[PDB]
Design a protein around this ligand. Structure first.
Ligand SMILES: NC(=O)C1=CN([C@@H]2O[C@H](COP(=O)(O)OP(=O)(O)OC[C@H]3O[C@@H](n4cnc5c(N)ncnc54)[C@H](OP(=O)(O)O)[C@@H]3O)[C@@H](O)[C@H]2O)C=CC1
Ligand SMILES: *C(=O)CCCCCCCCCCCCCCCCC
Ligand SMILES: CCCCCCCCCCCCCCCCO
Ligand SMILES: [Fe+2]
Ligand SMILES: [Fe+2]
Lengths: 218, 342
């Protein structure tokens, strides 16, 4: 499993996406603080957890011979960024939570789960740690929206329709490079849908609702 | 809580069943969508025993499709089963039947060594293949069909297609020592397992499929065929009783002719309606009353509080286990599906 040549090329922008993603969740969790007063402290701790993951994944590029493409990654996330930027700037917290704690977290759970069995051993130990934190972050969105379910349901449905299609587009853009790191797109969709479905269920959506929402844009 | 882990027979059925129950997006998609689809609880079930005990259960769609095997999507098929079993466990289901090919995939791809599924470590005592009940039911169906048609089973020949299989080997053991079948034709692909089953029984002629059928008064179909084969009635004795226990059906066509009797193998009927609509999809004759024997085994384990992997692995089913599940099957109100006449 020679992890040199095109592996580093593919890794050049996959590693970038993971850095910028961990960055985006840091920002997004700090602004969610600014948005939900009686809960800034908890949101700052989760925001800090993102900080640490971002540094861990710089190391994996520094363990291989890789300098990430931060520009490609910022272009990768700009649609999700703009949607989070605009929901924040309109005070739409329910949309902000769906984007960050549901969509982005499940994107991370899927991505890392699929990564761990085919990483280099150094990257595997790091990824192994971060994945457990992402499950509790998703739990923040879940409990918030679960407690505020009736109030948030209509907006969750709208925000799912506007944002979940972006996951499919991003998973196709990044599809080729993901495969050469040993990551089948088909497994990524599946793990994403499993993680996303379970959160929607805990939030209080029914199976029929989940199956309609989870396949939107696909 | 019991669970029923199933799958559909083909993409076409997956579209129809998905076309029903709403689900417009799940019913226009091809193989690749199902290959990445997550397991889902799509039905909640309540069953009342003849004893009056009320149990509750859940149907889990694994999203496995037989076409995955023919398309060599072996890792896809492996994930469908592990994801479904993980899903049953996460929902706290005590005993779940691995219906149809989900148990075959489990054995054939050594899924036991993959019990680590994301967060979860699979607990195998929470699952059963349901195969002990299935083999018992199929044996009772041979017995009853023989009597219905005035055939003497002690002087008849029974070909078992998939004789070395988990279900097939159990059928053989019972047809031998409990029913006293005249002749047993053992039909399987792998020669070593055929030799070993013949030795274990102390009887039985091993014959490839194309030579077995013209010799058989009864053909029990319990093969792991993804697709199903076209048998011409002209190849068969008269009478010939075809008990097709395959899922998907081992008979890929409607075999009919003078002296030919076809019976859906490994199906039981309950004395009470069950509220649900999966067996409606499953194309039973009376879907409110009838179901696959493997699914009925999970209900039986739950009726009895036998929260264990009662049927597990391959070639491990005994006559004593078949008797125990059979006694419970009768007591809780289940009866083997019989030949339809008139
Ligand atoms: N309640 C019900 O109605 C149930 C129905 N079933 C159905 O019946 C089938 C048998 O179940 P199970 O015993 O778990 O599966 P197994 O894999 O244990 O049984 C299949 C056996 O039949 C033989 N076989 C498979 N394909 C062919 C073929 N094309 N031609 C000849 N022989 C073949 C194989 O022998 P070899 O090893 O030599 O290849 C194998 O040992 C399943 O496909 C399932 O769909 C199963 C359980 C319950
Ligand atoms: C025993 O081993 C054989 C078990 C057969 C496997 C299950 C077949 C019956 C279930 C199909 C009925 C309806 C399923 C609904 C699927 C929903 C898809 C969205
Ligand atoms: C290290 C694994 C790389 C997987 C590549 C799959 C596509 C890119 C996924 C990026 C997900 C980053 C999410 C970070 C947010 C964490 O809260
Ligand atoms: Fe993170
Ligand atoms: Fe996170």
């Amino acid at each position: 499993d020679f992890q040199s040549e095109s592996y580093k090329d593919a890794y050049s922008r996959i590693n970038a996406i993971v850095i910028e993603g961990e960055q985006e969740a840091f920002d997004n969790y700090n602004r969610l603080a600014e948005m939900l007063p009686d809960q800034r402290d908890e949101l700052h701790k989760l925001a800090k957890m993102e900080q640490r993951h971002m540094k861990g994944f710089m190391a994996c590029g520094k363990n291989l011979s890789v300098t990430p493409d931060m520009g490609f990654a910022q272009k990768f996330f700009e649609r999700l960024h703009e949607n989070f930027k605009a929901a924040a700037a309109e005070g739409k917290v329910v949309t902000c939570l769906l984007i960050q704690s549901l969509i982005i977290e499940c994107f991370a759970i899927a991505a890392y789960n699929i990564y761990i069995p085919v990483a280099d051993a150094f990257a595997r130990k790091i990824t192994e740690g971060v994945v457990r934190d992402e499950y509790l972050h998703r739990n923040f969105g879940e409990e918030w929206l679960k407690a505020n379910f009736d109030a948030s349901k209509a907006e969750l449905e709208e925000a799912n329709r506007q944002n979940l299609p972006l996951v499919w587009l991003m998973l196709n853009e990044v599809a080729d490079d993901a495969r050469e790191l040993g990551m089948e797109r088909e497994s990524l969709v599946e793990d994403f849908m499993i993680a996303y479905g379970e959160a929607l269920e805990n939030i209080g959506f029914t199976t029929r609702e989940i199956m309609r929402m989870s396949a939107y844009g696909l | 809580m019991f669970g029923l882990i199933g799958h559909l027979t083909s993409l076409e059925q997956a579209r129809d069943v998905s076309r029903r129950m709403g689900y417009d997006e799940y019913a226009d998609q091809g193989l690749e969508f199902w290959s990445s689809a997550p397991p889902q609880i799509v039905d909640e079930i309540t069953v009342t025993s003849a004893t009056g005990k009320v149990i509750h259960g859940r149907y889990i769609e694994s999203c496995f499709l037989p076409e995955m095997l023919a398309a060599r999507r072996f890792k896809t098929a492996t994930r469908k089963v592990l994801n479904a079993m993980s899903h049953a466990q996460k929902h706290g289901i005590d005993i779940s039947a691995l219906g149809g090919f989900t148990s075959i995939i489990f054995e054939n791809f050594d899924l036991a060594s993959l019990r680590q599924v994301r967060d979860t470590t699979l607990e195998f005592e929470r699952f059963t293949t349901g195969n002990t009940h299935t083999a018992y039911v199929i044996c009772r169906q041979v017995e009853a069909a023989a009597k219905t048609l005035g055939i003497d089973i002690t002087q008849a020949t029974v070909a078992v297609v998939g004789a070395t299989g988990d279900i097939g080997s159990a059928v053989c053991r019972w047809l031998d020592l409990k029913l006293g079948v005249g002749d047993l034709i053992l039909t399987a692909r792998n020669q070593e397992r055929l030799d070993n089953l013949q030795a274990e029984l102390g009887r039985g002629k091993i014959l490839p499929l194309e030579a077995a059928l013209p010799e058989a008064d009864f053909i029990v179909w319990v093969a792991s065929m993804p697709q199903g084969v076209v048998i011409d009635p002209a190849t068969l004795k008269q009478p010939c009783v075809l008990i097709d226990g395959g899922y998907p059906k081992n008979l890929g066509s409607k075999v009919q002719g003078e002296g030919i009797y076809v019976l859906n193998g490994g199906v039981v009927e309950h004395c009470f309606d069950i509220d649900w609509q999966i067996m409606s999809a499953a194309e039973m004759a009376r879907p409110e009353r009838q179901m696959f024997a493997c699914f009925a085994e999970a209900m039986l384990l739950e009726f009895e509080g036998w929260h264990t992997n009662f049927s597990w692995g391959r070639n491990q089913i005994t006559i004593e286990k078949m008797e125990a599940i059979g006694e419970a099957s009768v007591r809780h109100g289940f009866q083997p599906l019989a030949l339809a006449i008139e």
